[PDB]
């Protein structure tokens, strides 16, 4: 019986998944995707490419309606009619949207054709994750839609410049993406929510802080950690939480509106908020660690180099620049790494970098790699520790 | 060993897939997708929604470049430099595209970082399947991209009309999709190729023709099968192939440009080509089977009903209208069924129909359902046989 | 001078023939024949009956040899020796054949006893006209040769039946001519060519189509013209050519081998090819004109009536059956009209019909004559337009 | 007006014909045929070749019925019904035959659709002319029908032998025509009637008998005229009628059954009947004239030479052989001359001979041409007078 075989496959893979850790589950999930692609028929391939698109659009609709937030807090299954009436949606439209969502696990459909939250419902109700889905829809999809014709009309150039990539066609502007976004209020607002999502795990799970510090001393008034473009300051918060008695200043640097949004959730003491544009010379001199997490991936080499060159003059011999970012392998890179690469190429003109490419970029700033501490698998994120050459 | 467990899952799923038939494999693939969604983390969900989009754009680029056709005929692994030079693509752009393609099995990457075709490479080289992927990119994506704001601006109406749906916003026209496409030569050419893609399996795998014929006589000169909107005439070709000894006219009806396209590959004898617009009265009288495959799903009820009403006056008591189309269940419909429903709502104003919904529609034309012969699983396609009431 | 008077008669008859049109020339030629018969001596009459026979046999020989085609493309006079050597004929036989041919204008002999093409040479080089001469030799001659003894043996019956006429004696078969010919591949090939001979002028020279159409609507998708037994479709081609702006389907109906032959020279669009045996019910409903040209003369009344009865149930009140055929007068009929009558009696058991005889036949099928449009003189060919009674 | 023009042409040609003599009328008749052929259309040519055939068959039917003899003696116009009842013919068949006959002047149709004899009716009632038409039907038409395939299968030989020509295929025999006919009683009987038709004019109209005789003397018991194969003896009869007091025996030679048929109409004295086969040595020695009229045209050169070589040994210096036969011109020969040539080639293996060819044949027998006396025009018949070399 097919039904019996399929249910047995689900039972065994669930049991294997439960018994491993997050990294093993990620490896199982990638293997299931690989199996799906290897076993699908030719028309399956076309249907999946034709339709998987639609999930982002329907998630955006559900977010517009407040559906996921609402279903996440309901105590009993809801009919489509109840949901349509509550959320202000046409009843037939609501019913068709809910059936589609149930088929892709965005909600769950009961045996009496009512609706309850799934894992994905709960995810899409979390503000920062909702904001990620909304960002994919309004910022990533237009640049991906523009890329094929952008490349064709330009005879397939190597993209190297933030002011000359698919973004400019997609949004009919000569501005680079970051400059243009900062002129668009609703888009800015969605980004500020996006910063509230903290990734797990983080570099402190494998970073040997004591070993890296050695005998370093914080007197007088030296900084232990300068978080450059630190956003809500999650790295500063976690560092103070794990090492509450390490001396040295811990400093969150970002632009004033971001530091303003961070104040609500910062500890009342132990972390300084310091407005600072990372395209300008670094004000804190001789800090132990200058930390750049998910910063330099967003810039082509020329601009990423300029960001590093604003920091290096502030370093002393004990200073390190810690780049915490993706470090895809030389071969066999996974879909999240390469898909990121194609997206940031299209929007920002930038690229993912292997270890060798990070080293080549850093050497242009007069830095050499001392240590690399990976903390996620199988997609590689690592804290790369650089010193002056 | 984590790697060892994942490789054993792959081996056992591959062997179970070989242990069954195409319908069992379709059920296994749906289960693999369900498992992926149930085991992904919240961040994973957002990453998958953000990036799976990119596959369609990158397939479109590969198609523009002729990459899939070229790789599918190579006799050895090719480097990225070789492919770039051969196809006229920037070397770095080509390398980054190939790495992305390999991570989603659109090509395979070898251990020495060269590239060979995968099953998906071969699919995307086939003109009718390539044309489906191109159709998704250029026609389906824009209407899905317009849908959330269309609904928001109109306060979530029930879409009922081909002239008032997302298509009009997507393409800035007051025409309906069918009327607009006929003005756009680029899109027309791709549709021409798309019509050459024959789906498999087809209704003749389960249709009990001799049972349905009973004692019908083709004498004196009656028509056995009238393929209304039959496209390239695949249904007529397969009927004559499976039932070479059954007498009766076999008639392909379509518009003149489509008929002229069909001539190249129609049998030299045995199948008539008859120009006929199915919005006008059916000219062939007293045929045994009037066949409508993937026609009525493209029309809202009012228009679908008109197409049926144009056939009914030609029927005698033995005639049947055979609707070959999707028949999703009352609940638990699969993602290809509900995704189709949302896409055709957005582009055409139409809908997928359950068995009860088909019966209500056909009852309005004076028809009753005599039999239903499913021929695909788990997504339901079936030949529904209707008689006069 | 005797010679001078004869040459002056030739000059004046030639100038009068140029002074008039094709119908006046046909009347002059009939008068010339009448004069010949009235002025010949009794011996002359016997000599003419004994020898005029020979022309058909000698034309058949010239056709076998390819003589007419070859002479028609020669740029200078040819001697008998040159032609014999070129065509592979005995020299003395060739010389004697050419002298005979020149004496009956099948070629012309020059003053230095060489040969050039005449009008008749050119005619016999044309495949459809050559095929008519070959048809006379191989099909008509044997039935005429059998007729006197057939009648004598059967004590001069009224011939009424296609299965009981001279044809059966001539070819020693109990089949009727149409059934027997379809077993004889040599004769079939010649008939194929014979169908390519288009007669001129045709009914459209005098048929008042717009008058006969009145306010008939081709909407929604009605048929303007159904050419029943239309052969190569010449009537359909000329209709579309003279009336390029009149809407309505134009449909050529014949048997499949004839339709396949017609495809080479049919327009690329505008004329449908529909296989249809005219002994079965007419499938096209409500056409304006159902056209039968040179069909019903080949059938005795019982069978001609059946062909008409197969059309009548398809007619609506505006439909007309148009019989395009010979309509000889009540008296004074010309030799081509009565000769046709005796030949088709002998081969097919059928007959020429006067206007009153056509009306009696059509009345048996429930039809009435609305109009008659002659288009040749003095031998009467006319498009007779019949409606429902 | 066409009718007025045509009637004026008939009036003027009739008046011109009446005012000339028989030779001028023959020239007018040939010119009318030539005009007909030069002015006919291509399809006219085919129709005339298809149909003029039928006249011989219908004349044969009329002869079988006794129609022409009967109508020739009726005193008033007869209806078709009256004729059918009187002659034992189906009424509808009779009516169709009479309409056909009237259209080719074989009878005349009155304005009230009754029937009276024409010139041709009277001709076909004369026994010997009737027998000529019957001979054309039963003997000439089968050999002409066999000729094209006979020549094709033998790759177009020069026909030179009476035992190897179309006759043998036509009648499935290895006999020569004369030998075969003498075994067929009805055919023999028709030939004996054929001999009763006397041609006009004859050679005595221009033969200068007195000049050719000079001083020749009939004593003792010498013959003036020996008519070899003389048939009914018309030449002997006319010679005695024109020169009743020329001395010398006048001797009719033929085979016994022909001499028997001649007795009824020979003068009771002055002409001897002498059985003699002209393939055997001539018994009458030293006659003045040995006369061969329409004999040698029926034999190929070898046999014609043998006939002459049986006569020459009987000649003295004053003897002449007089060949009275066709003498076609070197060029421009008329249809009756060349058609005769093709017919006797096909039946007898023989040929028409020009003056030069007669001289070459006669020289092989040791004869030289002394004088040639033509007596018909434009088709040449002449008495050619030969002496010993
Ligand atoms: C991708 S978010 C990374 C946040 C943080 N490093 C983390 O991982 O938790 C990029 C951050 O860079 C900040 N940023 C952008 N442009 C900046 C600039 N010119 N100077 C300083 N910060 C900037 C943004 O405000 C945002 O907080
Ligand atoms: C989705 S394709 C279906 C083809 C075919 N039934 C099959 O399954 O193989 C839709 C077909 O309808 C035809 N079509 C569209 N409008 C039509 C009309 N008004 N009359 C007749 N055919 C039409 C198209 O030309 C096309 O061939
Ligand atoms: C004399 S041809 C006439 C052609 C045509 N009507 C014209 O005038 O140009 C007779 C035609 O009848 C067709 N025919 C003979 N039997 C037929 C049948 N049973 N059904 C349909 N066509 C038939 C022949 O194939 C042929 O093309
Ligand atoms: C064409 S008819 C010519 C008659 C005659 N010379 C005339 O013109 O009035 C040929 C004649 O030759 C005769 N004939 C045929 N064979 C013969 C033979 N072997 N010997 C003698 N006469 C023969 C026939 O009987 C017939 O009368
Ligand atoms: C922060 C963003 C983090 C998550 C996204 C997931 C999918 C790939 C994409 C690539 C990243 C992300 C990233 O890695 N960097 C920059 C942008 C970005 C894209 C368009 C406009 C502005 C920013 C991103 O979408
Ligand atoms: C079979 C059509 C082709 C394949 C699509 C697969 C995914 C859903 C989508 C819905 C179908 C399809 C369909 O089912 N009907 C009509 C259209 C269509 C869409 C836009 C313009 C023109 C036609 C389609 O894309
Ligand atoms: C138009 C046909 C062809 C031309 C002929 C001209 C002379 C009279 C004759 C009578 C017609 C014709 C005709 O009119 N009808 C049918 C036949 C026919 C005869 C034998 C076998 C098959 C067909 C014909 O020869
Ligand atoms: C006497 C014959 C005289 C008249 C015929 C007129 C047509 C030409 C044909 C040629 C002649 C004729 C002739 O000239 N000679 C011999 C035969 C003949 C033919 C077949 C069998 C037997 C005799 C004839 O038909
Ligand atoms: Cl492969
Ligand atoms: Cl079968
Ligand atoms: Cl039809
Ligand atoms: Cl459902
Ligand atoms: Cl010419
Ligand atoms: Cl027109
Ligand atoms: Cl039809
Ligand atoms: Cl008549
Ligand atoms: Na429930
Ligand atoms: Na159910
Ligand atoms: Na479902
Ligand atoms: Na009349
Ligand atoms: Na007449
Ligand atoms: Na009369």
Query: Angle formed by the axes of helices D185-194 and D127-135, to 10°?
Result: 130
Q: What are phi and psi of A349, to 5 degrees?
A: 70, 15
Enter the DSSP assignment of C378: T
- Separation CA A265–CA A300 (nearest Å): 32
Tally of CA atoms within 13 A in the half-sphere of B157 that contains its CB: 13
Which secondary-structure segment (H or E) carries A47?
A: helix A42-51
**Can you tell me the distance from the alpha carbon of A209 to that of A239, in angstroms, rounded to the nearest whole number?**
10
Which one, of D379, D325, D267, lies nearest residue D27 by Cα?
D379
Residue A330's closest CA among B78, B97, B54, B99?
B99
Contacts of C172 (CB under 8 A, 6+ apart): none
Which of B198, B348, B350, B379 has the most ligand 6 atoms within 8 A of CB, as the residue to mutate?
A: B348
Extract the runs of DSSP E, i.e. beta strands, from D233-319.
249-254, 272-275, 289-293
Residue C347 and residue C165 in contact, taking contact as beta carbons nearer than 8 Å: yes
Beta carbons within 8 Å of B387's beta carbon, 6+ residues apart: B317, B319, B320, B367, B368, B370
Residue B340, number of CB atoms within 10 A of its CB: 23
How many angstroms separate the CA atoms of B338 and B123, rounded? 24
Cα separation of D51 and D40, whole Å? 15
Q: Is C46 on the interface with D (CB under 8 A)?
A: yes
Q: What letter does residue D344 receive in the DSSP assignment?
A: H
CB atoms within 10 A of CB C19: 11
CA D167 distance to own-chain centroid: 19
CB contact under 8 A, C40 and D53: no
Phi, psi of C226, deg, nearest 5: -120, 110
Residue A293, annotated ligand binder?
Answer: yes
CB D181 within 8 A of CB D187: yes
Does C313 show up as a binding residue in the annotation? no
Element (H, E) at B275: strand B272-275
Assigned token pair, D180:
């075969």
Tell me which residue has its CA closest to atom 5 in ligand 2: B230
Joined together, the tokens standing for residue C193 give 């060519």
For C71, what's the count of Cα atoms within 13 Å in the CB-facing half-sphere?
32
Cα D175 to Cα D57: distance, rounded to the nearest angstrom:
27
| Both structure tokens of D355 | 């003056």
Residue C110 CA, distance from chain mean position: 33
Q: SS3 sequence, A283-318?
A: CCCCCCEEEEECCHHHCCHHHHHHHHHCCHHHCCCC
Question: What atom in ligand 2 is closest to the CA of residue B231?
Answer: 27
Question: In chain C, which residues have their Cβ closer than 8 Å to the Cβ of B280?
Answer: 220-221
Write b or e for each residue in B262-276: b if 16 or more Cβ atoms lie within 10 A of its Cβ, otherwise e: beeebeeeebbbbbb
Q: Count Cβ atoms below 10 Å from residue A205 Cβ, excluding itself.
A: 12
> Is the backbone of residue C311 left (phi > 0), alpha (psi -120 to 50) or beta?
alpha
CA-based nearest residue to C276, from C241, C231, C315, C337: C231
Distances (CA, A) of A217 to A211, A226, A288, A388: 14, 15, 9, 19
Which pairs with CB-CB distance under 8 Å and at least 24 residues apart come from D364-372? Answer: D364/D301, D364/D305, D365/D305, D365/D308, D365/D309, D365/D312, D366/D312, D367/D308, D367/D312, D367/D321, D370/D320, D371/D212, D372/D327
Residues of chain C positioned with their CB less than 8 A from the CB of D34: 10, 105
Q: Do C284 and B284 touch (CB under 8 A)?
A: no
Q: Rounded to whole angstroms, how far apart are CA atoms B194 and D137? A: 71
Q: Are the beta carbons of A141 and A56 closer than 8 angstroms?
A: yes
Residue C336 corresponds to which tokens in the numbers above? 């081509």
* Cβ–Cβ gap C283/B284 under 8 Å: yes
Q: What span, in angstroms and rounded, lies between the C-alpha atoms of D142 and C141?
A: 10
Return the residue of B nearest to A340 by Cα.
B51
- With 0-12 CB in 10 A as exposed, 13-18 as middle and 19+ as buried, what is B286? middle
Cβ-based contacts under 8 A for chains A and B = 321
Residues within 5 A (CB) of ion ligand 20: C 330
Give the end-to-end CA distance of chain B in Å, rounded to a whole number.
66
Contact C201, C375 (CB under 8 A): yes
How many angstroms is it from B261 CA to the middle of ligand 4?
78
Q: Please give the Cα distance from C29 to D37 (Å, whole number).
A: 9
Q: How far apart are CA C106 and CA B33, in angstroms?
A: 87
- For residue B135, which atom of ligand 6 is closest to its CA? 25
First to last CA, chain C: 66
Helix H or strand E encompassing C232? none
The gap between the terminal CA atoms of chain D, to the nearest Å, is 66
**Taking Cα atoms as reference points, which of D376, D177, D223 lies closest to residue D293?**
D376
d(CA C222, CA C250): 9
Binding residues of D: 137-150, 229-230, 254, 277-278, 293
CA atoms within 13 A on the CB side of D145: 21
Give the other-Cβ count within 10 Å of D92's Cβ: 16
In three state form, how does the secondary structure of B155-208 look?
CCCCCCCCCCCHHHHHHCCCCCHHHHHCCCHHHHHHHHHHCCCCCCCCHHHCCC
CB C135 within 8 A of CB C58: no
Cβ <8 Å between B280 and C256: no
Ligand 16 midpoint to CA C145 (Å): 23
Give the position, in ligand 1's atom list, of the atom nearest the Cα of A293.
Answer: 6
- Angle in degrees, 0-180, between the axes of helices D127-135 and C42-51, rounded to the nearest 10: 10
Q: How far is D113 from chain C (nearest CA, A)?
A: 7
- Residue extent(s) of CATH 3.40.50.150 domains in chain D: 203-330+352-388
Q: How many CB atoms are located within 10 Å of the residue C171 CB?
A: 18
Using CB atoms, which residue from C280, C281, C285 is nearest to B283?
Answer: C285
Give alpha helix (H) positions in chain C. Answer: 2-18, 22-39, 42-51, 54-65, 67-73, 80-87, 91-103, 119-125, 127-135, 141-153, 166-171, 177-181, 185-194, 209-213, 234-242, 256-263, 301-311, 335-348, 355-364
Which positions 124-153 of C are in contact with D (Cβ < 8 Å)? 124, 126, 129, 132-133, 135-137, 140-142, 144-145, 147-148, 151-152
Which residues are D227's β-sheet partners? D252, D291
Q: How many angstroms separate the alpha carbon of residue A55 from the centre of ligand 19?
A: 14
Question: In the 8-state DSSP scheme, what is residue A330?
Answer: S
Nearest-by-CA chain C residue for B314: C285
Annotation-wise, does A202 bind a ligand? no
Return d(Cα D305, Cα D303) in angstroms, integer. Answer: 5
Fold of D203-330+352-388: Rossmann fold (3.40.50)
Find tokens 């026209």 and name the residue.
B173
Residues in chain C: 389
Cis upstream peptide for A166 (omega within 30°): no
B272 contacts in C (CB within 8 Å)? Answer: 274-275
Report the Cα D222 to chain-centroid distance in Å.
31
Q: Which residues of B touch A129 (CB under 8 A)?
A: 42-43, 45-46
Among the partner-chain residues C52, C199, C342, the one whose CB lies closest to the CB of D43 is C199
Chains with 3+ CB–CB pairs under 8 A to A are B
For B187, B222, B271, B317, D198, the CA distances from C283, given in Å and listed in that order, are 37, 9, 16, 18, 67
Q: Which atom of ligand 2 is nearest to the CA of B298?
A: 1
CATH of domain A203-330+344-388: 3.40.50.150
Instruction: With beta carbons less than 8 A apart as the criterion, state whether A386 and A312 touch.
Output: no
Q: Residue D135's closest CA among C49, A233, C131?
A: C49
Helix and strand numbers, DSSP H then E, in chain A: 19, 9
Assigned token pair, A244: 């509450």
| Alpha-carbon span D290 to C375, nearest angstrom | 64
Contact between C206 and C374 (Cβ < 8 Å): yes
Q: 3-state class of D148 per DSSP? A: helix
**Rounded Cα–Cα distance for residues C109 and C307 (Å):** 51
Chain C closest-CA separation from residue D22 CA (Å): 9
Which CATH number is associated with domain C2-125? 1.10.10.10
> Are D279 and D306 contacting, i.e. CB atoms less than 8 angstroms apart?
yes
Say whether D371 sits in a helix, a strand or coil: strand
Query: In this structure, which residues have their CB less than 5 angstroms from ion ligand 17?
Result: A 77, 110, 112, 114
Written as one string, the DSSP assignment of B45-81 is: HHHHHHHTTHHHHHHHHHHHHTHHHHHHH-SS-B-HH
H helix or E strand, kind and range, residue C321: strand C320-326
Ligand 5, atom 10, lies closest to the CA of A340
Place of tokens 């028509």: B223
Query: Which residue ranges does chain A devote to CATH 3.40.50.150?
Result: 203-330+344-388
Q: Are C337 and C344 in contact (CB under 8 A)?
A: no
Q: At what angle do helices D91-103 and D54-65 cross, to 10 degrees?
A: 130
User: C347: Cβ below 6 Å to ligand 7?
Assistant: yes
Contact yes or no for B269 and C285 at CB 8 A: no
In Å, how far are B286, B386, B388 from B321, measured between CA atoms?
11, 5, 9
DSSP summary character for residue A349: S
Give ∠ CA B366-B372-B378 in degrees, rounded to 5. Answer: 135
Atom of ligand 1 nearest to the CA of A198: 9
CA atoms of C14 and A174, how far apart (whole Å): 88
Q: Where in chain B is the domain with CATH 1.10.10.10?
A: 2-125
The Cβ of residue A25 has, within 10 Å, a number of other Cβ atoms equal to 18
Q: Are C199 and B259 in contact (CB under 8 A)?
A: no
Query: Which atom, in ligand 5's list, is nearest to the CA of A140?
Result: 20
A175 burial class (0-12, 13-18, 19+ CB within 10 angstroms)?
A: middle
Task: Tell me which chain B residues have a C-beta less than 8 angstroms from the C-beta of C274.
Answer: 272, 274
Q: Is A61 helix (H, G, I), strand (E, B) or coil?
A: helix
From the list D180, D153, D248, D154, the residue with the least C-alpha distance to D210 is D248
B107 touches chain A (CB under 8 A): no
Of A219, A122, A179, A150, the closest CA to residue A348 belongs to: A179
Touching subunits for chain D (3+ Cβ pairs under 8 A): C
- Distance of alpha carbon C350 from alpha carbon C222, whole angstroms: 34
Measured distance CA(B292)–CA(B294) in Å, rounded:
7
Instruction: Please give the full DSSP string across C147-192, using - where no structure is assigned.
Output: HHHHHHHTTSPPP--TTSSHHHHHHT-SS-HHHHHTT-HHHHHHHH
Tell how far the Cα of C36 is from the centroid of ligand 22, in angstroms: 25
Do A61 and B151 count as a contact with CB atoms less than 8 A apart?
yes
CA-to-CA dists, residue B184 to B139, B258, C213, angstroms: 12, 16, 38
Residues of chain B with CATH 3.40.50.150: 203-388
Q: How far is CA B228 from CA A193, B231, B322, C273, D92, in A?
A: 54, 9, 10, 18, 54
Query: Hey, what's the torsion of the CAs at B5, B7, B13, B14, to 10 degrees?
Result: -160
DSSP state of D277: -
The phi and psi torsions of C376 (rounded to 5 degrees) equal: -135, 155
Assess contact for B129 and B197: CB atoms under 8 A.
Answer: yes
Query: How many residues make up chain A in this entry?
Result: 389
Please give the distance, rounded to the nearest whole angstrom, from the Cα atom of residue A258 to the centre of ligand 1: 8
Contacts of A104 in chain B (CB under 8 A): 37, 335, 339
- Give the residue from B79, B156, B161 with the most A CB atoms within 10 Å of its CB, the best one to mutate: B156
- CA torsion A145-A149-A155-A157 (nearest 10°) is -20
Dmax (CA) for chain B in angstroms is 74
| CA A79 / ligand 17 centre spacing (Å) | 8
Q: How was this structure determined?
A: X-ray
Q: What is the DSSP letter of B288?
A: S
Q: Decide which of 3.40.50.1220, 3.50.50.60, 2.40.280.10, 3.40.50.150 is the CATH code for B203-388.
A: 3.40.50.150
Q: A with C: 3 or more CB pairs under 8 Å?
A: no
What is the widest separation between alpha-carbon atoms in chain A?
74
Within 8 A of D35 by CB-CB distance, chain C residues are 9-10, 13-14, 32
Chain C: partners with 3+ C-beta pairs within 8 Å: B, D
Tell me how far CA of residue A239 lies from CA of A202, A322, D83, in angstroms. 10, 14, 135
Contact B276 C221 (CB under 8 A): yes
Q: Is any Cβ of chain B less than 8 angstroms from the Cβ of C218?
A: no
């Amino acid at each position: 019986s097919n039904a019996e075989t399929v249910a047995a496959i689900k039972t065994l893979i669930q049991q294997l998944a439960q018994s491993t850790d997050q990294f093993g589950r990620a490896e199982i999930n990638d293997a299931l995707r690989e199996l799906q692609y290897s076993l699908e028929t030719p028309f399956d391939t076309v249907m999946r490419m034709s339709l998987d698109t639609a999930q982002v659009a329907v998630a955006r609709i559900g977010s517009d309606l407040g559906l996921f937030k609402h279903l996440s807090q309901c105590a009993s299954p809801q009919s489509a009619e109840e949901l349509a009436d509550h959320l202000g949606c046409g009843r037939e439209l609501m019913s068709r949207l809910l059936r589609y969502m149930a088929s892709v696990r965005m909600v769950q459909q009961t045996d009496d054709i009512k609706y309850i939250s799934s894992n994905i419902t709960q995810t899409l109700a979390v503000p920062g994750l909702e904001a990620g889905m909304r960002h994919a829809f309004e910022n990533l999809w237009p640049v991906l839609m523009a890329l094929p014709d952008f490349l064709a009309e330009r005879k397939y150039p190597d993209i190297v410049d933030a002011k000359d990539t698919a973004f400019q066609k997609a949004f009919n502007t000569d501005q680079d993406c970051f400059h243009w976004l900062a002129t668009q209020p609703t888009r800015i607002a969605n980004f500020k929510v996006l910063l509230t999502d903290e990734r797990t795990p983080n570099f402190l799970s494998t970073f040997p802080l004591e070993k890296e510090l050695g005998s370093w001393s914080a007197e007088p008034e030296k900084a232990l950690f300068v978080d450059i473009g630190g956003g809500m300051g999650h790295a500063c918060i976690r560092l103070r939480e794990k090492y509450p008695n390490q001396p040295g200043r811990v400093i969150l640097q970002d632009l004033p509106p971001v530091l303003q949004a961070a104040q609500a959730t910062l500890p009342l003491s132990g972390i300084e908020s310091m407005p600072h544009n990372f395209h300008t010379p670094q004000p804190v001199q001789g800090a132990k660690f200058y930390f750049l997490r998910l910063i330099l991936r967003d810039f082509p080499d020329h601009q990423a180099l300029e960001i590093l060159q604003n920091i290096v003059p502030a370093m002393d011999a004990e200073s390190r620049i810690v780049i915490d970012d993706g470090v895809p392998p030389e071969k066999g890179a996974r879909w999240a790494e390469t898909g990121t690469d194609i997206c940031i190429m299209s929007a920002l003109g930038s690229k993912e970098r292997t270890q060798r490419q990070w080293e080549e970029l850093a050497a242009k700033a007069g830095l050499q790699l001392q240590a690399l501490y990976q903390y996620t698998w199988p997609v590689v994120n690592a804290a790369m520790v650089f010193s002056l050459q």
